[PDB]
mmCIF file of C-alpha atoms in Angstrom:
data_model
loop_
_atom_site.group_PDB
_atom_site.id
_atom_site.type_symbol
_atom_site.label_atom_id
_atom_site.label_comp_id
_atom_site.label_asym_id
_atom_site.label_seq_id
_atom_site.Cartn_x
_atom_site.Cartn_y
_atom_site.Cartn_z
ATOM 1 C CA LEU A 1 152.951 89.439 83.486
ATOM 2 C CA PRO A 2 153.076 91.313 80.153
ATOM 3 C CA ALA A 3 149.922 92.754 78.499
ATOM 4 C CA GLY A 4 147.662 90.120 76.891
ATOM 5 C CA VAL A 5 149.400 86.931 78.051
ATOM 6 C CA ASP A 6 147.058 84.572 79.928
ATOM 7 C CA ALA A 7 147.474 82.346 82.928
ATOM 8 C CA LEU A 8 147.727 78.617 82.298
ATOM 9 C CA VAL A 9 146.623 78.159 85.820
ATOM 10 C CA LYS A 10 143.095 78.629 87.139
ATOM 11 C CA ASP A 11 142.441 81.245 89.843
ATOM 12 C CA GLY A 12 142.940 80.016 93.364
ATOM 13 C CA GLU A 13 144.737 76.875 92.278
ATOM 14 C CA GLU A 14 147.663 75.459 94.310
ATOM 15 C CA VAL A 15 150.952 75.988 92.437
ATOM 16 C CA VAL A 16 154.415 74.473 93.040
ATOM 17 C CA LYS A 17 158.056 75.457 93.041
ATOM 18 C CA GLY A 18 159.168 76.346 89.497
ATOM 19 C CA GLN A 19 155.771 75.456 88.097
ATOM 20 C CA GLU A 20 154.411 77.277 85.073
ATOM 21 C CA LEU A 21 151.570 79.745 85.643
ATOM 22 C CA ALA A 22 152.139 81.256 82.190
ATOM 23 C CA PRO A 23 154.566 80.959 79.296
ATOM 24 C CA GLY A 24 157.347 82.716 81.163
ATOM 25 C CA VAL A 25 156.082 82.723 84.757
ATOM 26 C CA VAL A 26 157.950 80.769 87.388
ATOM 27 C CA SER A 27 156.572 80.154 90.914
ATOM 28 C CA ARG A 28 159.533 79.508 93.257
ATOM 29 C CA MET A 29 157.292 78.692 96.261
ATOM 30 C CA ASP A 30 154.536 76.294 97.130
ATOM 31 C CA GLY A 31 151.126 77.826 97.844
ATOM 32 C CA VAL A 32 147.847 79.291 96.499
ATOM 33 C CA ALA A 33 147.746 82.135 94.046
ATOM 34 C CA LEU A 34 145.197 84.754 92.931
ATOM 35 C CA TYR A 35 144.456 86.860 89.843
ATOM 36 C CA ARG A 36 145.291 90.510 90.052
ATOM 37 C CA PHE A 37 143.697 93.016 87.700
ATOM 38 C CA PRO A 38 142.396 90.643 84.978
ATOM 39 C CA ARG A 39 142.107 92.068 81.432
ATOM 40 C CA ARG A 40 139.460 89.582 80.120
ATOM 41 C CA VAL A 41 136.552 87.359 81.066
ATOM 42 C CA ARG A 42 135.005 84.586 79.046
ATOM 43 C CA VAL A 43 131.310 84.151 79.803
ATOM 44 C CA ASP A 44 129.964 80.950 78.372
ATOM 45 C CA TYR A 45 126.165 81.037 78.253
ATOM 46 C CA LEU A 46 123.766 78.112 78.032
ATOM 47 C CA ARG A 47 120.834 77.913 75.620
ATOM 48 C CA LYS A 48 117.976 75.474 75.805
ATOM 49 C CA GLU A 49 115.485 74.538 73.017
ATOM 50 C CA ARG A 50 112.927 71.859 72.200
ATOM 51 C CA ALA A 51 113.542 70.529 68.658
ATOM 52 C CA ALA A 52 112.330 67.562 66.750
ATOM 53 C CA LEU A 53 114.063 65.614 63.931
ATOM 54 C CA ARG A 54 113.920 62.392 61.944
ATOM 55 C CA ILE A 55 116.094 59.870 60.210
ATOM 56 C CA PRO A 56 115.776 56.127 59.215
ATOM 57 C CA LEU A 57 115.786 53.470 61.926
ATOM 58 C CA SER A 58 118.682 51.822 60.050
ATOM 59 C CA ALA A 59 120.555 54.897 61.155
ATOM 60 C CA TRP A 60 119.408 55.844 64.621
ATOM 61 C CA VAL A 61 122.094 55.125 67.205
ATOM 62 C CA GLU A 62 119.338 54.740 69.840
ATOM 63 C CA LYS A 63 120.761 56.754 72.806
ATOM 64 C CA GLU A 64 119.251 59.067 75.343
ATOM 65 C CA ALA A 65 122.184 61.135 76.535
ATOM 66 C CA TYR A 66 124.320 62.179 73.616
ATOM 67 C CA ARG A 67 127.532 63.485 75.028
ATOM 68 C CA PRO A 68 129.579 66.289 73.163
ATOM 69 C CA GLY A 69 130.545 64.061 70.284
ATOM 70 C CA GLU A 70 128.636 60.910 71.120
ATOM 71 C CA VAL A 71 128.327 59.127 67.781
ATOM 72 C CA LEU A 72 124.932 59.689 66.189
ATOM 73 C CA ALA A 73 123.065 57.144 64.010
ATOM 74 C CA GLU A 74 124.360 55.076 61.039
ATOM 75 C CA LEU A 75 122.582 56.075 57.810
ATOM 76 C CA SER A 76 123.084 53.695 54.880
ATOM 77 C CA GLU A 77 123.374 56.625 52.416
ATOM 78 C CA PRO A 78 122.918 60.408 52.182
ATOM 79 C CA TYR A 79 119.370 60.454 53.482
ATOM 80 C CA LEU A 80 117.457 63.698 52.847
ATOM 81 C CA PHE A 81 116.081 65.393 55.907
ATOM 82 C CA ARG A 82 112.508 66.112 54.653
ATOM 83 C CA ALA A 83 110.424 69.036 55.836
ATOM 84 C CA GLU A 84 107.248 68.222 57.795
ATOM 85 C CA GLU A 85 106.102 71.823 57.523
ATOM 86 C CA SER A 86 106.053 75.058 55.464
ATOM 87 C CA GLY A 87 107.644 78.317 56.679
ATOM 88 C CA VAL A 88 110.601 80.638 56.261
ATOM 89 C CA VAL A 89 113.668 78.999 57.525
ATOM 90 C CA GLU A 90 116.335 80.138 59.972
ATOM 91 C CA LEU A 91 119.963 78.993 59.611
ATOM 92 C CA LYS A 92 121.312 79.159 63.174
ATOM 93 C CA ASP A 93 124.361 77.201 62.286
ATOM 94 C CA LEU A 94 126.532 76.497 65.327
ATOM 95 C CA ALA A 95 129.925 74.941 64.890
ATOM 96 C CA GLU A 96 129.596 71.722 62.915
ATOM 97 C CA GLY A 97 125.888 71.508 63.649
ATOM 98 C CA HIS A 98 123.123 73.601 62.104
ATOM 99 C CA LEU A 99 119.705 74.539 63.409
ATOM 100 C CA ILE A 100 116.557 75.403 61.507
ATOM 101 C CA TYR A 101 113.548 77.356 62.667
ATOM 102 C CA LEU A 102 110.321 77.070 60.634
ATOM 103 C CA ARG A 103 108.026 79.969 60.983
ATOM 104 C CA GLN A 104 105.212 81.296 58.850
ATOM 105 C CA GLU A 105 104.510 85.015 59.138
ATOM 106 C CA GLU A 106 105.971 85.669 62.564
ATOM 107 C CA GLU A 107 105.300 82.656 64.798
ATOM 108 C CA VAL A 108 107.418 79.491 64.626
ATOM 109 C CA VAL A 109 105.741 76.332 63.498
ATOM 110 C CA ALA A 110 108.638 74.222 64.761
ATOM 111 C CA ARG A 111 112.372 73.848 65.125
ATOM 112 C CA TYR A 112 114.590 71.096 63.585
ATOM 113 C CA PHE A 113 118.036 69.874 64.757
ATOM 114 C CA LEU A 114 120.876 69.196 62.286
ATOM 115 C CA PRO A 115 123.882 67.275 63.689
ATOM 116 C CA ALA A 116 127.414 67.192 62.273
ATOM 117 C CA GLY A 117 127.656 66.496 58.538
ATOM 118 C CA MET A 118 123.997 67.446 58.049
ATOM 119 C CA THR A 119 124.109 70.275 55.592
ATOM 120 C CA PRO A 120 121.550 73.048 54.919
ATOM 121 C CA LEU A 121 119.764 72.823 51.554
ATOM 122 C CA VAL A 122 118.379 76.332 51.763
ATOM 123 C CA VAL A 123 119.828 79.785 52.792
ATOM 124 C CA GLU A 124 117.935 81.438 55.651
ATOM 125 C CA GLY A 125 114.637 83.056 54.788
ATOM 126 C CA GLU A 126 114.169 80.942 51.676
ATOM 127 C CA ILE A 127 110.717 79.379 51.623
ATOM 128 C CA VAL A 128 110.270 75.674 52.161
ATOM 129 C CA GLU A 129 107.301 73.329 51.819
ATOM 130 C CA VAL A 130 106.132 70.051 53.383
ATOM 131 C CA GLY A 131 108.227 67.096 52.219
ATOM 132 C CA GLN A 132 110.661 69.662 50.820
ATOM 133 C CA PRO A 133 114.275 68.641 51.069
ATOM 134 C CA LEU A 134 115.777 70.285 54.153
ATOM 135 C CA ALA A 135 119.078 68.668 55.093
ATOM 136 C CA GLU A 136 121.429 65.848 54.116
ATOM 137 C CA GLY A 137 123.279 63.652 56.529
ATOM 138 C CA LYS A 138 125.733 60.925 55.356
ATOM 139 C CA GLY A 139 127.676 58.157 57.143
ATOM 140 C CA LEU A 140 128.864 59.495 60.488
ATOM 141 C CA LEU A 141 126.363 62.431 61.107
ATOM 142 C CA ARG A 142 127.351 62.670 64.747
ATOM 143 C CA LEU A 143 126.504 65.080 67.625
ATOM 144 C CA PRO A 144 128.361 68.403 68.009
ATOM 145 C CA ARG A 145 131.418 68.635 70.230
ATOM 146 C CA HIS A 146 129.991 71.507 72.470
ATOM 147 C CA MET A 147 126.418 70.335 72.908
ATOM 148 C CA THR A 148 124.397 67.827 74.943
ATOM 149 C CA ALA A 149 121.160 65.935 74.175
ATOM 150 C CA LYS A 150 118.775 65.520 77.078
ATOM 151 C CA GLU A 151 115.450 63.601 77.189
ATOM 152 C CA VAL A 152 115.248 61.428 74.085
ATOM 153 C CA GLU A 153 111.921 60.897 72.341
ATOM 154 C CA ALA A 154 110.374 57.861 70.537
ATOM 155 C CA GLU A 155 108.207 57.951 67.429
ATOM 156 C CA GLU A 156 108.315 55.039 64.973
ATOM 157 C CA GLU A 157 106.856 55.188 61.488
ATOM 158 C CA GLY A 158 108.025 52.841 58.699
ATOM 159 C CA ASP A 159 111.707 53.129 57.790
ATOM 160 C CA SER A 160 112.279 56.747 58.851
ATOM 161 C CA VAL A 161 112.064 57.136 62.619
ATOM 162 C CA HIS A 162 110.944 60.376 64.326
ATOM 163 C CA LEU A 163 112.584 61.596 67.552
ATOM 164 C CA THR A 164 112.822 64.853 69.496
ATOM 165 C CA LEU A 165 115.426 66.349 71.921
ATOM 166 C CA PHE A 166 115.532 69.095 74.521
ATOM 167 C CA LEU A 167 119.154 69.488 73.586
ATOM 168 C CA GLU A 168 120.801 72.528 75.101
ATOM 169 C CA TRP A 169 124.040 74.091 73.779
ATOM 170 C CA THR A 170 126.639 76.596 74.870
ATOM 171 C CA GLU A 171 127.020 80.124 73.441
ATOM 172 C CA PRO A 172 130.178 81.594 74.897
ATOM 173 C CA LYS A 173 131.159 85.167 74.666
ATOM 174 C CA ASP A 174 133.944 87.103 76.347
ATOM 175 C CA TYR A 175 134.458 90.714 77.495
ATOM 176 C CA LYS A 176 137.547 92.887 77.647
ATOM 177 C CA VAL A 177 137.555 94.733 80.964
ATOM 178 C CA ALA A 178 139.087 98.165 81.360
ATOM 179 C CA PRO A 179 141.239 100.046 83.988
ATOM 180 C CA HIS A 180 138.208 102.100 85.000
ATOM 181 C CA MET A 181 136.286 98.888 85.673
ATOM 182 C CA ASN A 182 136.324 96.204 88.383
ATOM 183 C CA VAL A 183 134.884 92.665 88.564
ATOM 184 C CA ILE A 184 131.813 92.088 90.757
ATOM 185 C CA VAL A 185 131.675 88.301 90.443
ATOM 186 C CA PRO A 186 133.806 85.435 91.604
ATOM 187 C CA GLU A 187 135.903 83.210 89.283
ATOM 188 C CA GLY A 188 133.952 80.239 87.900
ATOM 189 C CA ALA A 189 130.665 81.678 89.162
ATOM 190 C CA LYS A 190 127.233 80.787 87.671
ATOM 191 C CA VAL A 191 125.553 84.043 86.565
ATOM 192 C CA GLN A 192 121.828 84.740 86.621
ATOM 193 C CA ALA A 193 119.877 86.580 83.892
ATOM 194 C CA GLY A 194 121.260 90.111 83.709
ATOM 195 C CA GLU A 195 123.770 89.565 86.574
ATOM 196 C CA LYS A 196 126.200 92.319 87.470
ATOM 197 C CA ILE A 197 129.628 91.377 86.001
ATOM 198 C CA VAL A 198 131.886 94.412 86.090
ATOM 199 C CA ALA A 199 131.232 97.822 87.661
ATOM 200 C CA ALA A 200 132.763 100.678 85.738
ATOM 201 C CA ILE A 201 133.429 104.478 85.794
ATOM 202 C CA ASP A 202 130.020 104.980 84.214
ATOM 203 C CA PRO A 203 127.220 102.549 85.188
ATOM 204 C CA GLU A 204 126.599 102.072 81.392
ATOM 205 C CA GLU A 205 130.153 100.794 80.578
ATOM 206 C CA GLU A 206 129.352 97.907 82.925
ATOM 207 C CA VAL A 207 128.573 94.363 81.794
ATOM 208 C CA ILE A 208 125.547 92.229 82.535
ATOM 209 C CA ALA A 209 124.757 88.550 81.703
ATOM 210 C CA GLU A 210 123.694 88.237 78.144
ATOM 211 C CA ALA A 211 121.450 85.373 79.073
ATOM 212 C CA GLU A 212 122.787 82.874 81.622
ATOM 213 C CA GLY A 213 126.097 81.110 82.014
ATOM 214 C CA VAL A 214 129.520 80.720 83.499
ATOM 215 C CA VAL A 215 132.310 83.352 84.068
ATOM 216 C CA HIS A 216 135.930 82.524 83.514
ATOM 217 C CA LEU A 217 138.487 85.180 84.426
ATOM 218 C CA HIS A 218 141.544 85.439 82.120
ATOM 219 C CA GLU A 219 144.383 87.730 81.022
ATOM 220 C CA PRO A 220 145.292 88.784 84.532
ATOM 221 C CA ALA A 221 147.697 91.783 84.774
ATOM 222 C CA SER A 222 149.643 89.709 87.299
ATOM 223 C CA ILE A 223 149.224 86.835 89.782
ATOM 224 C CA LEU A 224 150.286 86.673 93.418
ATOM 225 C CA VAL A 225 150.857 83.452 95.305
ATOM 226 C CA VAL A 226 151.182 83.049 99.137
ATOM 227 C CA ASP B 1 170.832 108.600 109.968
ATOM 228 C CA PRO B 2 167.108 109.349 110.260
ATOM 229 C CA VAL B 3 166.859 111.351 106.923
ATOM 230 C CA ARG B 4 168.084 108.878 104.336
ATOM 231 C CA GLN B 5 166.204 106.448 106.581
ATOM 232 C CA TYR B 6 162.752 107.726 105.505
ATOM 233 C CA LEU B 7 164.359 108.215 102.023
ATOM 234 C CA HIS B 8 164.742 104.488 101.618
ATOM 235 C CA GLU B 9 161.594 103.805 103.665
ATOM 236 C CA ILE B 10 159.321 105.402 101.056
ATOM 237 C CA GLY B 11 160.794 103.650 98.065
ATOM 238 C CA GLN B 12 160.144 100.286 99.790
ATOM 239 C CA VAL B 13 156.734 100.221 97.955
ATOM 240 C CA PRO B 14 155.827 100.930 94.341
ATOM 241 C CA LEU B 15 153.636 103.936 93.784
ATOM 242 C CA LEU B 16 150.675 102.893 91.588
ATOM 243 C CA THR B 17 149.152 102.608 88.110
ATOM 244 C CA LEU B 18 145.987 104.271 87.013
ATOM 245 C CA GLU B 19 144.297 100.884 87.410
ATOM 246 C CA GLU B 20 145.471 100.313 90.968
ATOM 247 C CA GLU B 21 144.626 103.964 91.749
ATOM 248 C CA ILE B 22 141.005 103.760 90.612
ATOM 249 C CA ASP B 23 140.638 100.426 92.344
ATOM 250 C CA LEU B 24 141.986 101.795 95.586
ATOM 251 C CA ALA B 25 139.472 104.693 95.554
ATOM 252 C CA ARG B 26 136.829 102.185 94.613
ATOM 253 C CA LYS B 27 137.106 99.829 97.595
ATOM 254 C CA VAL B 28 137.772 102.885 99.768
ATOM 255 C CA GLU B 29 134.496 104.617 99.024
ATOM 256 C CA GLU B 30 132.609 101.349 98.887
ATOM 257 C CA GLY B 31 133.925 100.531 102.359
ATOM 258 C CA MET B 32 133.014 103.949 103.842
ATOM 259 C CA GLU B 33 129.519 103.850 102.428
ATOM 260 C CA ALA B 34 129.195 100.381 103.714
ATOM 261 C CA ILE B 35 129.936 101.932 107.075
ATOM 262 C CA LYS B 36 127.197 104.379 106.278
ATOM 263 C CA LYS B 37 124.633 101.575 105.640
ATOM 264 C CA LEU B 38 125.987 99.897 108.808
ATOM 265 C CA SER B 39 125.242 102.972 110.716
ATOM 266 C CA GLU B 40 121.643 102.524 109.619
ATOM 267 C CA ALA B 41 121.815 98.926 110.973
ATOM 268 C CA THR B 42 122.131 98.686 114.765
ATOM 269 C CA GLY B 43 121.564 102.383 115.167
ATOM 270 C CA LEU B 44 125.278 103.167 115.452
ATOM 271 C CA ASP B 45 126.601 106.659 114.636
ATOM 272 C CA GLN B 46 128.481 107.592 111.437
ATOM 273 C CA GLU B 47 131.969 107.958 112.937
ATOM 274 C CA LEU B 48 131.537 105.355 115.767
ATOM 275 C CA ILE B 49 131.942 101.994 113.983
ATOM 276 C CA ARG B 50 134.542 103.715 111.726
ATOM 277 C CA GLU B 51 137.114 104.222 114.489
ATOM 278 C CA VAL B 52 136.007 100.840 115.739
ATOM 279 C CA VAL B 53 137.151 99.458 112.365
ATOM 280 C CA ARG B 54 140.548 100.912 113.268
ATOM 281 C CA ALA B 55 140.157 99.181 116.709
ATOM 282 C CA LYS B 56 140.094 95.725 115.122
ATOM 283 C CA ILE B 57 142.297 96.484 112.094
ATOM 284 C CA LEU B 58 145.172 98.812 112.989
ATOM 285 C CA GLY B 59 146.046 96.352 115.667
ATOM 286 C CA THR B 60 145.281 95.004 119.097
ATOM 287 C CA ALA B 61 144.565 97.124 122.159
ATOM 288 C CA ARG B 62 147.736 99.164 121.401
ATOM 289 C CA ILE B 63 145.687 101.773 119.449
ATOM 290 C CA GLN B 64 143.566 103.309 122.273
ATOM 291 C CA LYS B 65 145.878 102.101 125.039
ATOM 292 C CA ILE B 66 147.802 105.361 125.397
ATOM 293 C CA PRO B 67 146.248 108.400 123.522
ATOM 294 C CA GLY B 68 146.856 110.492 126.584
ATOM 295 C CA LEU B 69 145.074 109.761 129.847
ATOM 296 C CA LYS B 70 141.856 110.723 128.128
ATOM 297 C CA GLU B 71 140.819 110.084 124.491
ATOM 298 C CA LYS B 72 137.744 107.816 124.500
ATOM 299 C CA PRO B 73 136.798 104.757 126.605
ATOM 300 C CA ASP B 74 138.082 101.439 125.145
ATOM 301 C CA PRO B 75 136.438 98.817 127.332
ATOM 302 C CA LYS B 76 133.129 100.670 127.569
ATOM 303 C CA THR B 77 132.314 102.601 124.275
ATOM 304 C CA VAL B 78 134.263 100.135 122.020
ATOM 305 C CA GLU B 79 134.090 96.592 123.423
ATOM 306 C CA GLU B 80 130.285 96.114 123.426
ATOM 307 C CA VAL B 81 130.137 97.595 119.858
ATOM 308 C CA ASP B 82 132.746 95.045 118.704
ATOM 309 C CA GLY B 83 130.321 92.382 119.971
ATOM 310 C CA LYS B 84 127.026 94.072 119.094
ATOM 311 C CA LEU B 85 127.254 93.551 115.292
ATOM 312 C CA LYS B 86 128.807 90.010 115.617
ATOM 313 C CA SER B 87 125.254 88.779 116.233
ATOM 314 C CA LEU B 88 123.917 90.110 112.989
ATOM 315 C CA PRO B 89 122.736 88.497 109.683
ATOM 316 C CA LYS B 90 124.557 88.193 106.340
ATOM 317 C CA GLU B 91 123.879 91.732 104.958
ATOM 318 C CA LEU B 92 125.237 93.677 107.997
ATOM 319 C CA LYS B 93 128.216 91.316 108.074
ATOM 320 C CA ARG B 94 129.156 91.696 104.406
ATOM 321 C CA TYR B 95 128.951 95.502 104.876
ATOM 322 C CA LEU B 96 131.297 94.977 107.899
ATOM 323 C CA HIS B 97 134.038 93.243 105.938
ATOM 324 C CA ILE B 98 133.632 95.762 103.127
ATOM 325 C CA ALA B 99 134.359 98.442 105.722
ATOM 326 C CA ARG B 100 137.512 96.540 106.812
ATOM 327 C CA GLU B 101 139.016 96.082 103.335
ATOM 328 C CA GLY B 102 138.015 99.690 102.438
ATOM 329 C CA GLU B 103 139.958 101.292 105.233
ATOM 330 C CA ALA B 104 142.969 99.186 104.527
ATOM 331 C CA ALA B 105 142.754 100.459 100.966
ATOM 332 C CA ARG B 106 142.765 104.037 102.218
ATOM 333 C CA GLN B 107 146.076 103.121 103.955
ATOM 334 C CA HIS B 108 147.894 101.698 100.996
ATOM 335 C CA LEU B 109 146.769 104.592 98.785
ATOM 336 C CA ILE B 110 148.130 107.034 101.340
ATOM 337 C CA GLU B 111 151.577 105.396 101.363
ATOM 338 C CA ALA B 112 152.016 105.625 97.559
ATOM 339 C CA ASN B 113 150.994 109.209 97.244
ATOM 340 C CA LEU B 114 153.134 109.742 100.431
#
């Protein structure tokens, strides 16, 4: 296998006669294969949070588990997400969804969740007040394609309903491993916090777990099947 | 013809890349030091379980069967050892397998640079 090309097959997966393990790779025998000298690993981390939010009841889709793209609310028109507190903001924007941290001085007063189509009305650090316009959803305003909403909350006041989620997203990052390095962890493993990933020539060139997540080996230098 | 024999016998295996080289040395030294830590386990010596690794790797009884009429006792000094660490928890066992793969690595290495 040539430098940089990946394997369309997962490590330790049964492959068949003539079957494609890569764009040009042909396996002429039936059996199990294995990665040999991988040149990359994608480590997709998970991140929790506890964040509240609000939107009219004529919107709210009324679901507990919002799957990665489970349709969110209804929203007769472009409702303004209105601030319930004052503090410097934080635009954490993640794929289609945005996140906003409200902190005065140092400590955070609270964090707000902004699904797809819900746009930031202020650049990060720009001061906001209570009742101050924060976001705008319209129409669809659905959940992000990489995230998951756990543990729905219920608070009902007038037209605009309040709700909170524990929603936890994924923050993936990969690493390009080197000839002087070697992988210490199995394919598809679940890493701890600061887990040993790849031991290198110098102990410093090594890789640890950024926070916590899953390791996926890719770009193998070659693959052998028995 | 025994000359050209070995001449084609050596080229039967590729030599190595820098990667493969460093990897070889890696599992080699890790294996040997695993044997060290294993020497601290059941109280075995440094070189003992090493040649025992050869006893269960390099083949069946064929290894110590005929090294002259005297080399070192197989059924006495080897056998019990082969069964003494089989009774041991996860740590000493992982160190065991590390030893095995390590010595094998030594071999492959040797052939290339041969």
